[PDB]
Amino acid sequence: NLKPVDAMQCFDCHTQIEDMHTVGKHATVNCVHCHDATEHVETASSRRMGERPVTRMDLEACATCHTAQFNSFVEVRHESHPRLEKATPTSRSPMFDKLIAGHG
Amino acid sequence: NLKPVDAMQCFDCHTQIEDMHTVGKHATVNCVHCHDATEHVETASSRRMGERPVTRMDLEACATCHTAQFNSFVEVRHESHPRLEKATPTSRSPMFDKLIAGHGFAFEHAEPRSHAFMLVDHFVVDRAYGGRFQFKNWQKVTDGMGAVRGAWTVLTDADPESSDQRRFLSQTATAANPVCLNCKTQDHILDWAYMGDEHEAAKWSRTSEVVEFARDLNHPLNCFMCHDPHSAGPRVVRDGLINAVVDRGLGTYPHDPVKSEQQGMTKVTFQRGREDFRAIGLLDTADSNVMCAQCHVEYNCNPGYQLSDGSRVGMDDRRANHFFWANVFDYKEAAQEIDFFDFRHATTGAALPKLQHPEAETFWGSVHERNGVACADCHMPKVQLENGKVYTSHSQRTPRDMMGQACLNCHAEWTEDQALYAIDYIKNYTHGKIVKSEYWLAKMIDLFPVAKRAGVSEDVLNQARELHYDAHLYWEWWTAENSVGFHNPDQARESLMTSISKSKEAVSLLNDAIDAQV
Amino acid sequence: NLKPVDAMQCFDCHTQIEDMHTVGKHATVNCVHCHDATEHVETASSRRMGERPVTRMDLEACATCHTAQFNSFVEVRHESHPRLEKATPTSRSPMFDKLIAGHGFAFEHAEPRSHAFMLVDHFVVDRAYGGRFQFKNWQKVTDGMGAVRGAWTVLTDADPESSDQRRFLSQTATAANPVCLNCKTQDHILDWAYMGDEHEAAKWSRTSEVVEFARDLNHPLNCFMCHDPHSAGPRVVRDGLINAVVDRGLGTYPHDPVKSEQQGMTKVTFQRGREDFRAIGLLDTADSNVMCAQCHVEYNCNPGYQLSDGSRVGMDDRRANHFFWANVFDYKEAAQEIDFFDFRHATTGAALPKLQHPEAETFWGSVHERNGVACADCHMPKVQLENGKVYTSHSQRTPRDMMGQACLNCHAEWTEDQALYAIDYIKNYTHGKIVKSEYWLAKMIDLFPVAKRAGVSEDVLNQARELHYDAHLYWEWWTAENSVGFHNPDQARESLMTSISKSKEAVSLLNDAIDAQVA
Amino acid sequence: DQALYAIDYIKNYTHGKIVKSEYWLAKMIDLFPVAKRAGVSEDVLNQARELHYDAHLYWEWWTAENSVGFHNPDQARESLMTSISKSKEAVSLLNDAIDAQV
Ligand code: HEC
Ligand code: HEC
Ligand code: HEC
Ligand code: HEC
Ligand code: HEC
Ligand code: HEC
Ligand code: HEC
Ligand code: HEC
Ligand code: HEC
Ligand code: HEC
Ligand code: HEC
Ligand code: HEC
Ligand code: HEC
Ligand code: HEC
Ligand SMILES: [Ca+2]
Ligand SMILES: [Ca+2]
Ligand SMILES: [Ca+2]
Ligand SMILES: [Ca+2]
Ligand SMILES: [Ca+2]
Ligand SMILES: [Ca+2]
Ligand code: NA
Missing domain, CATH: 1.10.287.3080 (Helix Hairpins)
Incomplete structure (x- = not known):
């Protein structure tokens, strides 16, 4: 304690x-x-x-007195697709590889 | 009665x-x-x-005493999108046409759908029979039970009076041959000698007129492909698999001699006129990994060419019915072992392999396989009933439809959404690398015409062609394989990174050579 | 293997x-x-x-080759509320205790639940075995598959060392007898002579010690009750039904000789030595009306008394195993034919019948029955599959769970909600008349002590008792019958109005008689 | 679900052929600058342009039409196969002509 x-x-x-x-x-x-x-x-x-x-x-230093805010923060939105590459035809930048060539 | x-x-x-x-x-x-x-x-x-x-x-021969298994088998998963071309930006291989140019799959390569349709889908796909066979009308595409009752109850033949493979529609190919049918039906089980070799007792063989053969065949995925009708015990009937496991001594788990011994296969041969004719492989255990490997493997089922001299390898050659029984990193060696490749790339001129759905070989060595999990555990689990006699679901489909039984009984730490999220992490990551691999392959491919026209030497072009074989292999394995990496995520990642590495090497080679000519 | x-x-x-x-x-x-x-x-x-x-x-003897039918059969309908007493304001018979006083059903009479439980529920109900048999614990009440595997896998016996019927719990009765079991199981099919008559070859009979008999029985509603295991053809095995249809010549459809001939039954007897022993009834057609009537009928399966002289009719008497095979308006005559009643009302002293679930006899003459519809059409329809081999659902339950296949394939003019509404119109109307019938029966019953104590004559009391028989019959048929009128709404209405009419007549009789003595 | 599945069979198949038609059209289109810059004759370019009209027509009908083949699946299939055939013809024509200039 x-x-x-x-x-x-x-x-x-x-x-x-x-x-x-x-x-x-x-x-x-x-x-x-x-x-x-x-x-x-x-x-x-x-x-x-x-x-x-x-x-x-x-973050658990705050969670003992503010469990609601902590638990809301740590929730995982499973609908936010994980590890989804942007350089694909179904994502944000279909031609990203050609356009960003030279960058990491 | x-x-x-x-x-x-x-x-x-x-x-x-x-x-x-x-x-x-x-x-x-x-x-x-x-x-x-x-x-x-x-x-x-x-x-x-x-x-x-x-x-x-x-299959109704089994359905009177095993209606539950039959009805589960014949169910159509409507959510498994039908006739969905893979060479589209929203499917598995956005740049497939450029990458596969020279191969028959360019004419059509759809995603798989429910097993009920396998034989009719084989007959009607644009790459197979020149458009000869079609559904009677577009309503019949829904009729899984009809297809199971028989292909010819739902299909038509454009010319019953001829038996030659030819094009009835302009943008079709005639890639089908008798070997294909062994992974669609075993209606011919008593009419086909082991491996499709010529045999006096066989009506059909590798060299048969495939249109004539087709007309003799009716039922998809017969129940007896996995269950011996006489013993009711577990088996395989697919010759190519028996050949790999038993004749070539590779074992059911080539990477694991202990598991191979525990979960082995015994070849039983049936004769005609006291000459060996056909064979089955009785399994030691009801091992779905090996049952499903009758079809969900990389194979030759086609003519091709020799790596050594480019000479034609026809359907008459044993190599036209071949299970490589090799994982992606052993494949090139396995293809060298039989001196074979499938096609020459239309643009690059590279000798290339054609890969097909290597789920079994991919699953080897994965965390699940090492832990004794098998295809059926995720794709045809036991049914859970509040009150009832348990049976095994025969609706072979994605675990997404039965996550409690397929995943969560083992993964007690997860909710359904968490398990789905874990699948999607792998699939999303793997797909991104597939797309990147295609980007780099396409970049290389597009340099070949430029290089040839700039007068780059055949020596450099051939070096690039050698890199193309590997860049292709380490990519196409994964568009061919249906799990989008889930079956072996680390292997997919290593392979696809290798594909990209090879393409990048070739791109640098060709760009430098072009720039030197200029 | x-x-x-x-x-x-x-x-x-x-x-x-x-x-x-x-x-x-x-x-x-x-x-x-x-x-x-x-x-x-x-x-x-x-x-x-x-x-x-x-x-x-x-039943697993059949399940190896007929898993779909078996699994459909053993399904538990959780929405069929379990152990729900009918004598409550929210169930079938709010005034049942007053009305049935003097009968063993006062100790407990629950609504039916899924078939898997029939034998265990028979064993454990408070009216049957003095509370001798109980579920092993309160968890086991859910275990339909376990009950099907065998009653004694889920139940306990309070005293395996005695075989007498006695009360182990204070508010129980010992009404069970061997006839009951014929509508719960046919495990005893080779051990019971036709009708439960005494027979040298029968281990069990009407006069057996029911506790001993119970211990030899395991499975509910055996598959072979409707299907001959040798021919696979449709049949019945229930002796009382074969006796009504064939022996007594009443036919499968007593109100329709043509249909009786087209959809008849052939009695087949099996001998032990040279003597007839058991029998089955092979059906001309796979007629679920007659299959289900093995059990969903009004019957005697109990001792009683004679209407003529009040003498006891024991289990030894053939009348203790009897299918009346009579509609509600023919029942009184049918009971007179065998000179039988069930109990004397505890308050009124009236000789009364006890009615049980007369679905088969109610369904006769209904619009659906006359149109060739049968129980299975609404309660165990063919399964409809997008792709598959059709089979017949064996989950015998309300059509509300499968309205597409139970109702709407025939009633193309209706939506599901419309069909449900039509059911509910009939049930609501019928239930209202049941409740009113009970109100008037209760009013009459309550006048009996007042009349007796006022010095009303036995002649007047006996006149009122004769009215009670009819008021009771024309009410109880409908609390016994499980459709709340749906199986025959016009008949329910006529009967229940008759009940009320009779009670009203008795109330007037007794009130006037009391008022005259006064005061 | 069955009716939806029948719609999607047609739409999926038709869309695949639309995509393939576009692949071949794009391949042809991309050869025009290469051909022009290599000095391929106006006669060959005009032959290819005539093929482009048909390749375009037998494709664009179907991106323009809103049913993705459902309204007339056999016609869509025949048309799109014709588009691809025309583009392939033009691709061969132009590649051969470019290769002959080189
Ligand atoms: C309990 C011992 C606490 C610890 C640990 C943390 N906080 Fe806290 N916080 C506490 C109290 C009693 C209050 C006041 C509540 C009220 O409304 O009177 C707060 C308040 C906050 C606020 C609101 C401040 C404002 O509106 O001005 C915030 C943003 C906050 N606390 C954050 C926070 C953080 C980030 C912590 C970990 C570093 C943390 N608190 C710990 C009690 C306790
Ligand atoms: C009824 C006349 C049957 C026919 C037709 C088929 N099968 Fe059968 N099968 C039948 C029985 C009575 C049993 C044994 C049931 C038990 O568990 O005791 C079986 C068993 C099987 C099994 C399980 C075998 C095992 O676990 O070793 C399988 C896989 C099986 N049957 C398959 C099968 C096939 C594929 C059929 C058509 C070729 C077929 N059965 C027909 C009864 C009957
Ligand atoms: C050859 C006779 C096969 C056997 C043995 C197995 N599968 Fe199969 N599978 C096969 C084909 C030809 C297809 C495509 C059918 C078509 O008409 O497109 C499939 C498909 C699948 C799928 C996809 C189903 C979907 O809903 O889209 C799955 C999940 C699948 N196969 C799994 C699977 C399993 C686990 C097997 C062993 C039990 C198995 N298949 C055997 C060919 C053959
Ligand atoms: C077993 C080793 C097979 C051989 C031989 C052939 N096919 Fe196949 N096929 C097989 C599987 C496991 C699947 C499902 C998995 C997948 O990735 O598709 C299929 C699927 C098909 C399909 C449907 C999908 C499609 O590509 O459009 C068709 C039309 C098909 N197969 C045709 C076909 C042809 C023409 C073959 C000989 C050249 C052939 N298959 C052989 C397994 C196997
Ligand atoms: C291989 C791809 C299979 C095909 C083709 C068929 N079945 Fe099957 N069956 C398969 C597996 C992996 C299992 C489970 C084995 C285990 O022990 O884990 C089964 C099981 C059966 C059984 C046994 C009872 C049960 O577990 O359900 C039966 C009776 C059975 N299968 C029948 C059957 C029928 C009728 C089929 C054609 C419709 C059929 N199987 C095909 C794998 C495969
Ligand atoms: C669980 C640990 C699995 C094992 C064992 C096997 N597969 Fe699998 N497979 C699994 C997943 C999570 C997925 C992705 C499904 C999704 O909906 O995202 C797959 C996919 C397939 C498919 C394609 C299914 C489809 O997309 O409709 C096929 C044809 C397939 N898997 C075959 C297959 C084989 C033959 C297996 C044994 C060698 C095998 N899988 C095992 C999970 C699991
Ligand atoms: C497998 C060894 C069986 C056992 C055990 C049981 N039945 Fe059967 N039954 C079996 C077969 C092969 C068939 C014929 C199927 C066909 O349509 O060809 C049947 C049929 C029935 C029927 C239908 C009869 C009819 O329509 O005339 C019924 C009602 C039936 N079987 C019932 C049944 C019962 C009650 C069983 C346990 C006592 C039983 N069957 C066992 C195979 C097998
Ligand atoms: C005697 C062996 C019976 C036969 C033959 C049929 N039924 Fe029955 N039914 C019987 C009992 C003893 C019970 C009550 C079981 C309990 O444990 O309480 C029932 C119950 C029903 C029900 C109610 C089911 C529910 O979900 O509550 C229905 C709808 C029903 N019975 C219908 C029915 C049909 C249609 C039959 C012929 C196919 C049939 N039963 C036969 C006893 C017996
Ligand atoms: C663990 C902390 C439990 C909780 C939460 C619930 N139950 Fe339970 N229950 C538990 C045990 C260890 C037992 C005894 C098991 C045995 O066989 O010895 C039970 C028992 C029951 C029973 C039977 C009671 C009886 O008198 O026979 C019932 C009906 C039951 N449990 C139901 C039940 C319900 C509905 C719960 C949620 C409200 C519940 N239990 C919680 C352990 C635990
Ligand atoms: C066939 C003519 C039957 C006889 C003989 C017995 N019962 Fe019965 N019982 C039968 C049916 C069709 C039903 C379901 C319909 C209904 O209205 O209940 C039942 C139900 C029961 C139940 C469950 C409901 C309840 O009353 O609590 C029990 C406990 C029960 N039956 C017991 C029982 C006894 C003790 C019997 C002999 C005195 C008896 N039943 C005979 C059909 C038939
Ligand atoms: C009477 C109350 C039944 C009992 C007990 C069982 N079944 Fe039945 N069965 C019944 C009917 C009314 C029908 C339909 C007849 C028709 O032609 O309309 C059936 C049918 C079957 C069949 C045939 C195949 C089918 O239609 O599904 C079989 C194989 C069958 N029944 C098996 C079976 C089993 C295994 C049972 C015990 C679990 C069983 N039936 C009991 C009526 C009755
Ligand atoms: C003559 C030498 C017999 C042979 C061979 C078989 N059975 Fe028999 N069986 C026979 C007799 C004289 C009797 C008694 C008939 C009587 O008068 O009571 C029987 C009886 C049966 C029974 C019923 C037993 C009962 O519980 O009452 C059955 C189920 C039975 N028999 C089956 C049966 C089988 C399956 C046989 C072949 C393996 C068989 N019997 C041969 C005489 C003879
Ligand atoms: C459709 C035209 C029916 C016919 C034929 C039979 N029954 Fe019926 N039944 C029907 C309805 C609409 C209802 C009411 C159900 C509801 O949920 O409101 C019933 C009820 C029963 C019950 C009680 C079911 C329950 O409440 O859970 C039983 C036991 C029953 N019916 C038996 C039965 C018998 C034996 C039949 C043939 C003689 C019969 N029903 C025919 C509709 C129909
Ligand atoms: C009656 C007014 C209809 C409407 C509404 C829909 N369809 Fe139809 N369709 C109808 C007929 C008479 C036919 C031909 C039947 C025959 O075998 O001759 C069809 C055919 C189809 C087909 C096949 C198309 C083909 O082969 O070219 C499909 C795929 C189809 N219908 C689907 C369908 C859809 C999805 C509908 C709702 C948008 C639809 N139809 C409406 C009659 C009628
Ligand atoms: Ca699929
Ligand atoms: Ca291959
Ligand atoms: Ca480009
Ligand atoms: Ca009920
Ligand atoms: Ca009675
Ligand atoms: Ca009062
Ligand atoms: Na067995």
């Missing part, structure tokens, strides 16, 4: 983040949802990063 | 039949269901046939 | 079978498909059976 960190400790060094986080609609969302910064906090200075914190870039 | 005959009387002379019939699941099925042998019994000796018994080859 | 036997050797002693088998469409079907006679052939003479050969009665 996630344990919240003291964001005020972060904000001592991260004024830009403070200015954004405390005003917006994620003011109640703790940093631990996306960052593991324990060793970073131990080693950073006001101007040097020290140990780099872990930052989650995965 | 049928009256049974005393089979014991038959068995006195027919020991092979006795051995098969008394042991299998047709031990109780009386001969009269399929044979009228009264005058035969009166006149035969132990070694001479006497009067020939009547043998039913119609 | 089956190995054929030498049928000619069998025929040296079985000339009767030879004469059927060699001429029909099963001449090539070897005996081994249905008989295991090896030890029999080793021990028999033409005059001594020796070891009894085994005869297969399972």
